[PDB]
């Protein structure tokens, strides 16, 4: 069927949309070519709609069914708990979109009588009505990027009302938080911190006689998800031990929301119908991961690829297997794509066989290689720094809800660019404004987390280890990329940052306390007479468990 059907009503913005990087003194410090940075707006919605709208072709086979059963079998071991209204309410981000029924996230988190009362009726309605399509809002997503030799048309997010969202959590939070791992095991990507992901990719790579890997980019995965895919996804959830009300809720949510439903713009106009995966629901991440995993695993058997290890993060897929030879691999890969195309997962860019782990891009990142104080090779996760930097500038010139830069510093603490540029730039600003103590919100695998800048040293050592503060001698490949990026964006070169870091480090050291700790560990690369960095006491006191359990992008989740 058609992924989408449009009435003609436009995807409207519910507020003024900013698309250009303002000429700000502070942003200008980080990057000079401000005209290269842009934010997508609803003005590009039609370009997207045309890209995501098409008929889906899907032919299933024996391999798909075999793998599906294997998956359900693991699923049968899961026992999911039905969250309470209070629990699910406590998971709602403070900035979440208000309900059109007289309340907002604030009232939800405060267990406001009005909110709760409405959440109850919505739930009661899910238990009674198994058919009525639940309404959803469609908005153009506002994201920041750098221009390219044109521009990316805004992505379209689709999400139901606040009430329904709390209800999703009640019935499915525990499930989407535990089922993926139980089913895919080591292959489930959101369970790993950046360090563990590299570990897994490196060990997996070395477990092959002669490794061959490739990333598989599905063309607009969300609109390639069929009603069949979503029901198959429910059949997997249905294998869990569920409370009676949770089973019905899931059965209803599937038919009324997850498989499709009416689309409404910000003005209340009927935009069209959706027959594919909505981006703004709680099951989006789990569902896509399961679907991507299922199709890929069946495609591997069908394609004759040997000993295929999957690492799946939602629609993002990486595959590592036993090479069978250059020509045999090219053939096998093409066969893999045909199987995937039949499973309704056509490729965007044709996949290419890789024989060098550092050449595979998954989750926009890749495994590189540097050295620690001792001088031994240390693997770590990195990526092209264009977008992170572009967004850093943006978030520097404008008050933005989520600070992707803070999230990038954490996820990419050991990289050349995050340490040399992100930490320097931001700490410098925070110190100049005396905000080193204000906690900031950021995201990790979709979930919102409140973090204090001064705590970064602990978090980094904990997530990455001490080597993140001593890495050096990066690969020529990683260096070239950072170099080109800076050249392209008009970002000051190494020397400029070192001088700035040397200044910040000193200023932080003079403040003592946690700030001094920031200056000693974060900026140890700036000095000649380096300090002897030892494990930070409070690092062992840290509990970053809930940080890397599952993916929640689009799920509207907040881990307090
Ligand atoms: N084009 C440039 O501006 C430019 C010019 C010369 C070199 C260069 O790469 C660099 C810069 C510093 C480097 C290395 C490579 C390295 O391999 N090994 C060590 N240091 C010191 C260093 C470090 F260990 C970590 C850190 F967090 C900042 C640092 F300073 C660059 C760049 F953009 F970083 F890629
Ligand atoms: Mg974990």
Curated annotation (Swiss-Prot):
Q: How does it sit in the membrane?
A: Single-pass type IV membrane protein
Where is this chain's protein located in or outside the cell?
A: Host cytoplasm; Host endoplasmic reticulum membrane
Please tell me where this chain falls within the complete protein, as first and last residue plus total length: 2420 to 2982 of 3010
Organism annotation:
Hepatitis C virus genotype 1b (strain HC-J4) (HCV)
Q: Which cofactor does it need?
A: Mg(2+)
How it assembles, according to the record, is:
Homooligomer. Interacts with non-structural protein 5A. Interacts with host VAPB. Interacts with host PRK2/PKN2. Interacts with host HNRNPA1 and SEPT6; these interactions facilitate viral replication. Part of the replication complex composed of NS2, NS3, NS4A, NS4B, NS5A and the RNA-directed RNA polymerase.
- Would you indicate the residue range of the signal peptide? none
Outcome reported for the amino acid change (mutating residue 402 to V): In strain: Isolate pCV-J4L2S
Q: What is this protein called?
A: RNA-directed RNA polymerase
Query: What's noted about post-translational modification?
Result: The N-terminus is phosphorylated by host PRK2/PKN2.
Phosphoserine, modified sites? 29, 42
Show where the RdRp catalytic domain sits.
Answer: 211-329
- Activity control summary: Activity is up-regulated by PRK2/PKN2-mediated phosphorylation.
Positions binding Mg(2+) 2 in this chain are 217, 315-316
> How is the co-factor bound, per the entry?
Binds 2 magnesium ion that constitute a dinuclear catalytic metal center.
């Amino acid at each position: 069927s058609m992924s989408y059907t449009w009435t003609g009503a436009l995807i409207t913005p519910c507020a003024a949309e900013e698309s250009k990087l303002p000429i700000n003194p502070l942003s200008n410090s980080l990057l000079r070519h401000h005209n290269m940075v842009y934010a997508t707006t609803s003005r590009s919605a039609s370009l997207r709609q045309k890209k995501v709208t098409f008929d889906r072709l899907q032919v299933l086979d024996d391999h798909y069914r075999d793998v599906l059963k294997e998956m359900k079998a693991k699923a049968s071991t899961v026992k999911a708990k039905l969250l309470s209204i209070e629990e699910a309410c406590k998971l709602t981000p403070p900035h979440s979109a208000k309900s059109k029924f007289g309340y907002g996230a604030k009232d939800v988190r405060n267990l406001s009588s009005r909110a709760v009362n409405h959440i109850r009726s919505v739930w009661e309605d899910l238990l009674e009505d198994t058919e009525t399509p639940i309404d959803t809002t469609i908005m153009a997503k506002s994201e920041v990027f750098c221009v390219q030799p044109g521009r990316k048309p805004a992505r379209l997010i689709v999400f139901p009302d606040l009430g329904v969202r709390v209800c999703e959590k009640m019935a499915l939070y525990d499930v989407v938080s535990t089922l993926p791992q139980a089913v895919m095991g080591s292959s489930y990507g959101f369970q790993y911190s950046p360090k563990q992901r590299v570990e897994f990719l490196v060990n997996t790579w070395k477990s092959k006689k002669c490794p061959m890997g490739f990333s598989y980019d599905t063309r607009c995965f969300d609109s390639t998800v069929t009603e069949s895919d979503i029901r198959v996804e429910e059949s997997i959830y249905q294998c869990c031990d569920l409370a009676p009300e949770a089973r019905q809720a899931i059965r209803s949510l599937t038919e009324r929301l997850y498989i499709g439903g009416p689309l409404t713009n910000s003005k209340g106009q009927n935009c069209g119908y959706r027959r594919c995966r909505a981006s703004g629901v709680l099951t989006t991440s789990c569902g896509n991961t399961l679907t991507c995993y299922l199709k890929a695993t069946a495609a591997c058997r069908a394609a004759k690829l040997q000993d295929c290890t999957m690492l799946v993060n939602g629609d993002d897929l990486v595959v590592i297997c036993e090479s069978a030879g250059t020509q045999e691999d090219a053939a096998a890969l093409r066969a893999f794509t045909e199987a995937m195309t039949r499973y309704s997962a056509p490729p965007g860019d044709p996949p290419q066989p890789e024989y060098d782990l550092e050449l595979i891009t998954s989750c926009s990142s890749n495994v590189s290689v540097a050295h620690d104080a001792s001088g031994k090779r240390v693997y770590y996760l990195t990526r092209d720094p264009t977008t992170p930097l572009a967004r850093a500038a943006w978030e520097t010139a404008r008050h933005t809800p989520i600070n992707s830069w803070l999230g990038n510093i954490i996820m990419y603490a050991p990289t050349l660019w995050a340490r040399m540029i992100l930490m320097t730039h931001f700490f410098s600003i925070l110190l100049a404004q005396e905000q080193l103590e204000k906690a900031l919100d950021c995201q990790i695998y979709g979930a919102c987390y409140s973090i204090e800048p001064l705590d970064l040293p602990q978090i980094i050592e904990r997530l990455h280890g001490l080597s993140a503060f001593t890495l050096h001698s990066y690969s020529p490949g990683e260096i070239n990329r950072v170099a080109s990026c800076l050249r392209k964006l008009g970002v000051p070169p190494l020397r400029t940052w070192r001088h700035r870091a040397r200044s910040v480090r000193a200023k932080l050291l003079s403040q003592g306390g946690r700030a001094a700790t920031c200056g000693r560990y974060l900026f140890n690369w700036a000095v000649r007479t380096k300090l002897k960095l030892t494990p930070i006491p409070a690092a062992s006191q840290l509990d970053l468990s809930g940080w890397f359990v599952a993916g929640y992008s689009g799920g509207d989740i907040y881990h307090s």
